[PDB]
Amino acid sequence: DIPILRGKSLTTYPREETFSNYYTTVFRYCHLPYKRREYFNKCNLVYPTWDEDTFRTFFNEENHGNWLEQPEAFAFPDKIPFDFKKIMNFKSPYTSYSTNAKKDPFPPPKDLLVQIFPEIDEYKRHDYEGLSQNSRDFLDLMEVLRERFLSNLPWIYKF
Amino acid sequence: DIPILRGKSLTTYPREETFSNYYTTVFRYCHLPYKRREYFNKCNLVYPTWDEDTFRTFFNEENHGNWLEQPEAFAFPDKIPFDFKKIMNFKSPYTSYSTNAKKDPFPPPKDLLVQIFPEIDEYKRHDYEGLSQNSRDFLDLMEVLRERFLSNLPWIYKF
């Protein structure tokens, strides 16, 4: 039920032409050519699209379990075509073996993390079973978000 | 025939929707609002439209040789509605006979004057008479423009 973003309402999505006003004001602030079709209407520079058929069929490993490898592992990171991941995330798609995660000067401490949103830390010290399955998965999502948040926080303070 | 601003060619005057683009761009750049007709037509507030009768009669002072003072002298300066002059020139219409426009410490020297636009000195020593009345009157007009130009250029230079 929770919208990713809201205005005055708590469940639905904010008003369309108010967003048109938003994008108009902002692209006139940064002095850029706004065109409304090119953000509100559909482009064709889009993500992959599937059936039920191959989606269940090809991503099942046991139908292809004779193989030395299953493509779900490497070139499909979690059912994503790999360039459709990295190009849309503005990356040169040319490793298949992304190991940039250890590039972290000063990984932030969790004692600073557990200050804000500590109820999440309570929920996994609550009956972790007693919550719905999407709930604690979203909670771990939020913890990853808070980690990235504190990670990127010093430049936000810097500027 | 020559427009005060040429367009693509010398003879042609520029195109309108190009100026609509100009207004749209500069006004969303200079952060000023813009409703379109408000800069593409006559306002309600314009200079007065005259007749033939009084415009050839009230200003013809042979009709009014009777008078102690003639109307064009003070308040109709060279056939000019006076507040239409000062308010459209953004000048206070209540002082009304100001004389401080002559003030210029370091007035524009004639040497730097006669250097720029040097054909004026020529066209005076050329056929200053047997050309059009538009010719030598426009020469005097260019003398006015050049006088303003030198008299007000160093602020542009400073800025």
From Swiss-Prot, chains A, B:
Superkingdom assignment: Eukaryota
UniProt subcellular location: Nucleus; Chromosome, Centromere; Cytoplasm, Cytoskeleton, Microtubule organizing center, Spindle pole body
Function, in words: Acts as a component of the centromere DNA-binding protein complex CBF3, which is essential for chromosome segregation and movement of centromeres along microtubules. CBF3 is required for the recruitment of other kinetochore complexes to CEN DNA. It plays a role in the attachment of chromosomes to the spindle and binds selectively to a highly conserved DNA sequence called CDEIII, found in centromers and in several promoters.
Quaternary state and interactors: Component of the CBF3 copmplex, which is formed of CBF3A/CBF2, CBF3B/CEP3, CBF3C/CTF13 and CBF3D. CBF2 strongly interacts with BIR1. Interacts with the central kinetochore protein CTF19.
Extra information: Present with 1350 molecules/cell in log phase SD medium.
Name used for this protein in its record: Centromere DNA-binding protein complex CBF3 subunit A
Full-sequence portion shown in this chain: 320 to 478 of 956
